[PDB]
Write a protein that binds this ligand. Structure first.
Ligand SMILES: [Zn+2]
Ligand SMILES: [Zn+2]
Ligand SMILES: [Zn+2]
Ligand SMILES: [Zn+2]
Ligand SMILES: [Zn+2]
Ligand SMILES: [Zn+2]
Length: 72
């Protein structure tokens, strides 16, 4: 699954749709290799944990979309 031919110079965009405890929202985009952009998206989620609580992710769009919810 998620078949991927990797290339160091590959350019991709990972969309992170965030939903917070009070239901507020925002979308953040990360660019670079699929692996790096993916790593940066989760790193951003981690920075928001202190103020917004633990996060849960549901991957979609074959991995290009990360729907992340914060528990508060
Ligand atoms: Zn799978
Ligand atoms: Zn190739
Ligand atoms: Zn192939
Ligand atoms: Zn790759
Ligand atoms: Zn690489
Ligand atoms: Zn704070």
């Amino acid at each position: 699954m998620h078949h991927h031919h990797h290339h160091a110079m590959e350019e991709v965009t990972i969309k992170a749709n965030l939903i917070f405890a009070n239901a507020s929202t925002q979308t953040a985009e990360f660019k670079g290799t699929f692996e790096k952009a993916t790593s940066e998206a989760y790193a951003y989620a981690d920075t928001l944990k202190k103020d917004n609580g633990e996060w849960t992710v549901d991957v979609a769009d074959k991995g290009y979309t990360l729907n992340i919810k914060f528990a508060g």
